[PDB]
Structures are given as structure tokens and as C-alpha cells.
Amino acid sequence: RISWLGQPMKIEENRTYYQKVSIDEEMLEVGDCVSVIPDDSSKPLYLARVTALWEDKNGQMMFHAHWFCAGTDTVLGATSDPLELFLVGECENMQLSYIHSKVKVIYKAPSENWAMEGTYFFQLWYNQEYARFESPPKTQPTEDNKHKFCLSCIRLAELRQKEMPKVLEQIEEVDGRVYCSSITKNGVVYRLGDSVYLPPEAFTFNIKVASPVKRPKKDPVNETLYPEHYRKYLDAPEPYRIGRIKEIHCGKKKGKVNEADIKLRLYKFYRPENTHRSYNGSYHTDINMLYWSDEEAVVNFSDVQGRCTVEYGEDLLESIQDYSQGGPDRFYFLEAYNSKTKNFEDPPNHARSPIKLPKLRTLDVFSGCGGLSEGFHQAGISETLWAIEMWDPAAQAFRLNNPGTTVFTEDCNVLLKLVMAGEVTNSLGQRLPQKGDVEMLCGGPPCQGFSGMNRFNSRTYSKFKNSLVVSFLSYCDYYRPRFFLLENVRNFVSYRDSMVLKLTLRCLVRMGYQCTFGVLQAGQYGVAQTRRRAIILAAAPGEKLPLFPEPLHVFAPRACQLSVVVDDKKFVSNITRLSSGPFRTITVRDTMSDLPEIQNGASNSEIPYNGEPLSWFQRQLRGSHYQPILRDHICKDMSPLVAARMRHIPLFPGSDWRDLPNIQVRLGDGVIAHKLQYTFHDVKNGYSSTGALRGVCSCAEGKACDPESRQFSTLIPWCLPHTGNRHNHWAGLYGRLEWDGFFSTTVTNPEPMGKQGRVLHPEQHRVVSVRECARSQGFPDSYRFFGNILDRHRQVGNAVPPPLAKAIGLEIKLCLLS
Ligand SMILES: [Zn+2]
Ligand SMILES: [Zn+2]
Asked: Where are the N6-acetyllysine residues found in this chain?
């Protein structure tokens, strides 16, 4: 029994809208919230806010339903509050007769005294694709639409407008094609003369590139000399193509422009490695130097990945260095390249041209030596005034690099209790930060004792409440910083069925924080290392929630699975550059080709560079102004035996322990290592080509371990064949880095037979040095470390690479504007 109330608000041709409707003699109004019963008795009750009421010519009495999302249908899942709802951009038109009931939905707004703190309700807008919880839109109804106003609809509408290709300015039609001077897509304006990013396969270069002369693959292998050789049964994409726009033309459909058919005709730009110089010719060139060319390419607008600035070197008002560091996607050229005569020349003339941010006061918990704080400092967004680092060498390291920061070498739990208690100072006179002092809180809480995937139970759930991850959040709750950053190892998101991640997102939401999570790969921000980190970003109610930085460098695909599965739902970050990118990858070579030769065990912490920077990367890390000191080019002093094994790993890419010869070697002691003996069969690995046995223990046949079989002082480590079968023949152990490759995750203590053992230098017979490890992270050469060599390695391997941290910093920098 459904009848309207009051006089109609507005009339259309097919619809008349109303402000009030009567359903079973009960007032319902635009703005009220409502429930609808699912056909599936097992799904949670449907809940919507009524955004509009209207009547059809055909007698249908309608309302527009803007749905809420229940907590358990977001990342939080079963951890979220039963009565909490979240806004989402999902709505549709439904007939009033489907409504089951009125509901009360309260907007729990953040209090005006929010910073000092610490019927369904809602507080945040949930983005289900990126797992972002964000402040609700501020958008208000205008008189014109006050009758149909739907937050969901406007968001979908605004999106459609941003996403779609639209031509802003037409010139003239020529031979069934309209030529344009300006177009737009996804919020970016592209004009004639602008440059564009394109997939590697958008177009081709006219230079001929001969497939290498190839090579035999060794000769036969003597298996008595190499009894373990038998166990040995560039993948990063190309960076973007770049082109200057020459013409822009699209077809016509039904006498109007067909915007799904916009085409751009471009001048190809050459990267140095695209000319014949290839890689051997560009080791030393700037990552953003290009070469002009008069080659033209036709491309679909749909393929344009973004806009970039490309300038002729001489027309610049600033210095090449200054221009380059001035903004993102800035390239330059100084010569043209004739693809036909392979020569470089001057550029044609038509190729030529025509509020200081306050720094956030920052507290860095579990600071380490300051890799994370260094990255923020570089972005210009923060000032770490307080750092907490319980382990003394690292704490001292932090002081060396941040003279201005109060470093508390102490347990974070007792420190927070001290401030909560109103104490102004710890026992050492150090002034504790107080409520209001801290604007940005960041840190990497060691999430120990949650690895692996067994369930969580009564006993495990509590230690989480008593873990350092909870301590970090307790900090967030007390200080209520404007921005919150939690860094960790990738598996933070998957620890204990993703329950650690879910409890930490639940916690940030309970406090009223906007928040999200994602995985990033340090390699993609200008470092030659695989290092995936989980990152939790949070922003106070009044702020913008940051985005994750777009990858800058192409990197090995296997190391860039940044996506996370939580209860079978796949979450991704806002990152859009899912394959290629602006800059070529940074190699082990870019990283440390300028460093003087040192020997196993070298201990002189100050030696001169005996020769200038060679890589773009080395120019960045050594600086533009003076320093003569190469600090920490020191390496661990290995056993005579371990040193000998190292002299014997061949220098070919992929070499490791299985390449070792079964020979007697004179050690540095002056001792001789005897030969490893094979006196057991391997039913799984068989006999060798020299008719030799391949087992070094009785368990290989397979029985049980033999009391005496074990062998000592042998070039081929006795144990590696012992258990080779169980561990893919221990590939990588005593393995050399490749000049063309990248570091495995940079470790706290580099050991050839350790967890991560690809730690031998590519040419010298030694493990990598403290400096090289600092370079594998993104540490400047001026960055200081402290303690013995093992202390310094630990500090370096633990840090967040400043280039990753900086990347995160610039995204926060965007949130201080807009
Ligand atoms: Zn809607
Ligand atoms: Zn055995």
C-alpha cells in the first residue's frame, strides 16, 4: 500500500521525483537508510541510503539505492565490527516495493579534538579494488540535483570523464581524417610538440641489430675433475618508447569525431642503448639522455602510457643536473642520430624549442641506521627529530647521519609508558616527544615469531597483542600523527592467514585513520636489488591518503608480483605501470664498477677512489661536490679454505659451488686440502660419465647416515653433495654476482654457504664489501656507518633503501598540496 507524500519536487518527461513517500503508512524520505532481503538466505542483509524517489509514467514507484558495504565484505573480513558499514561506489535503481525496513546509519565523524584522544554506523569510504579506506567525500548537493544526489553515481561519472579519450581541439579535416592540436585522456593533456610514453612494441627502430654471433657452449666436461658439474641442469622488460608528437588525427563516425580512433604520428627518440652503441656504449650515459631522430611512427592514442618532458640541452635555463632533479619524467638530448649512416650530429632546428613546504616533525621507530629516514629527508617532506633504536651501533650510526635528532637507545615499550605517564624526560635527560610534537610516525617493527602459515589459536593471538607491531600502533594511537608508515618484509601481509595484516588495518580504522596497504619492489625505484616490502600507509581524517609510487625502473618480472591475496580476494595497489617504465634497470655494474680492488679480509675503512664515477648511478651516489674518501670498502676475512673456494669459482654468469674442481689446493695457511672422495651410490643421481660414484654418505643409497663418512678440509664442501638432492643441488651457494644482474636481498651477514649466498664479487675472490652492500641499497657514499664490519653489514642489510623511501616520500609530498 504505497502512496506519495507532499507535492512533487521536480518533473522530467518520464519521471516525477518526490521528497517523501509513504510505505505502509510509514514516512520514508530521501536521505533515509533502508534494508533489502537477499534471495540467498546466507548473505548479509542489503543496506542502502535512499538518494532519490520518483514515479515512472508506467506506474512504477522507484527509489535510487546507494549501497553500504558491510565490514566483513572488505579486507577486514571477520575482524571488523559487526555494526560498522563503509561507503562504496555501488548503487542502482530499485522499486520501493522491495524495501524490507528502515535502518539508522550514524556518521561517526572525527571529533574536533581527535588528535588528543587515545544502529549501524560508518566512517570511511571503502575502495574494494585497492583496499583503501578513505575520508568520505565532502561533495554537497546543489539545488539543481538536491532531488537525485548520489555520491556513488557522481564518483562513477567523474571516473568515466577522466578515463575517456576526448579531443579538446580540432584543426582541419584532410582526406577523411580530422587533425587536432590537443587531446586528453585520464586527466593528462597532450598537445602538439609534447612527448609520450609507449610500450616497447608500439614501434620499431630502423637501425639493424644483428642477433649475436652466438658461441659454442663450452667443450666436454671432465667429470672426475668436476664431479658436481652435473647438477646444473636479461629478463627485465624494455623501458618505454618515447616520441615527440608531430600530428594528431582521428577518423569520423556518423559525421562526428570518432574518439575511439585517435592516432598520433611521432618522431622516434633513441635511447643510447637503442643505437648501435647498445649496452657496451651506454654504461656511462645519463638514464634520461636521449638522441633525436627524424624517424616517424604512427601509434594508437590508446597505447600512450603517459606524458613526459623532452628538451634540447642548449635551450635550457637551468643546468642539466638541476633540470633533471627538478621534476619527474624529464629527459634531454644533445645530438641527433642518423639511423642510416649510424652517425651522430647536431639536431635539426624544428627539434629545438619555439610556499616552502613545512617539514613534518617525524618520529622514526625501529630506525636502524636511518635508511628510511634518509629517503624521507631526500624528498624534503620530513625532519626526523626523534629516533628509537634499541641496538646501539645502529643508534650511533643514526646520530652520525642526523646530528639534529634525539636518538633514544632504549626499549620502546618503557619509553611510551614514560610519556603516557606525563614524564618529560627519560633517565638520561633526553626530552621525550609529546602529544602534538609528532606529525609523522614511521617505522619497521620486527615482526618476528609469526612466520609460516599455521592458524592462529588462543595462544598465538595474544602474543600479537604483546608484539612490537602492537607497540608501533600504540604509538600511532597516542600521538595521532598526520601520516603513518609501517614498513616490513613482504610476508607481513600473509603472516598467519593474513591475520596480522587484518588486525593492523582493523586497528587503524578503529582510531579513525584513513589507510591502505601494498607491496613495492625496491628494484623499481633505482636500486640493483630484489627487495619486496609490505607498506601500510595511514592518514589522519583531515588529510589525503597517499598513493603508492609508480615504478621508475624496469625490473625482472619474477621479482615484481606486488599483488596480495587475502581470503582468496586479490588486492592490488594504485600502481598502474604493471610492465614497462621510464628508466632502464640499474645493474650490479652500475652499482659498483668504480670501486678500487680489495682483497679478502681488507680492513682499511678509508681509501681514495682511484678513479672517477663511471655510471649514472655512481655519479648520484658520490655527488657533484667534493669528497676524496671511499668509506667502508672493507670485506670479511674468510678461512684459508673459504678463500680458496672463492679463487676457484669461475667468472662466467651462473657459476657457483657445482663448478668447483675436485683437486688438492694449497691454502693460505700453507696446508693442502685433500680431495673429496665418493664412496657411496646415489640411486637417484646414478653413476657419472667417468664411471665414478656420486654419493658421499650411506644415506644416498638410501640407508641412514654413516658414522665416519663425513669429510673435512675439502675444496668441494663435503656437506653440499650430502644433502644436494633435498635442496635443488644448492644452486647459488658460493655463487658470483653478475655484472649484468642484481643483488639478491641484501643480507645482514654475507656468507657463501648462508641462506642467501650469491655474495661473491663478479671478478674478485671475496665477498661483497660494506660499501658495495650500501650501494646495493641506495645509500650515498657520504652516509656513515659504525662498529665492526659485522655491525656495519647488519646496519646496511636492515635499512629501507633510501630510493624506495624517497619514492614513498614524494607521494606523501603530494598530500601536503591538492
Ligand atoms: Zn547512484
Ligand atoms: Zn648421509
From this structure: 20, 148, 214, 218, 232, 570, 636
Please name the method used to determine this structure.
X-ray
> Which listed residue (33, 447, 635, 773) is catalytic?
447
Q: How far is the CA of 48 from the centre of ligand 1 (A)?
A: 10
Q: What is the Cα–Cα distance from 382 to 504, expressed in whole angstroms?
A: 24
695 CA to centre of ligand 2 in angstroms: 9
CA-CA-CA-CA torsion sign (8, 9, 11, 15):
negative
Ion ligand 2: residues, Cβ under 5 Å? 697, 699, 705
After which residues do gaps appear in the chain, with C to N over 2.5 Å?
Answer: 118, 233, 354
Q: Are residues 753 and 653 in the same domain?
A: yes
Residues 314 and 174 in one domain: yes
The secondary structure of residue 208, as a DSSP letter, is -
Last residue of a domain, one of 122, 157, 185: 122
Per the annotation, does 311 bind a ligand? no
Smallest CA-to-CA distance from 313 within 326, 336, 332 is with: 332
Q: Which residues of 478-498 are buried (b: 16+ CB within 10 A; e: fewer)?
A: bbbbbbbbbbbbbbbbbbbeb
Q: Is 371 annotated as a binding residue?
A: yes
Q: 555 near 521, Cβ under 8 Å?
A: yes
Tell me whether residue 606 is in a domain. yes
Domain finish residue from 338, 356, 374: 356
Q: Cα–Cα distance between 78 and 66 in angstroms, integer?
A: 24
- Has 447 been annotated as catalytic? yes
Ligand 1 centroid – CA 36 distance (Å): 16
Measured between alpha carbons, how far is residue 633 from residues 119, 588, 756, 808 in Å? 65, 16, 21, 29
Resolution stated for this PDB structure, in Å:
3.1
Domain around 542: 123-146+357-592+779-818
638 is in an annotated binding site: no
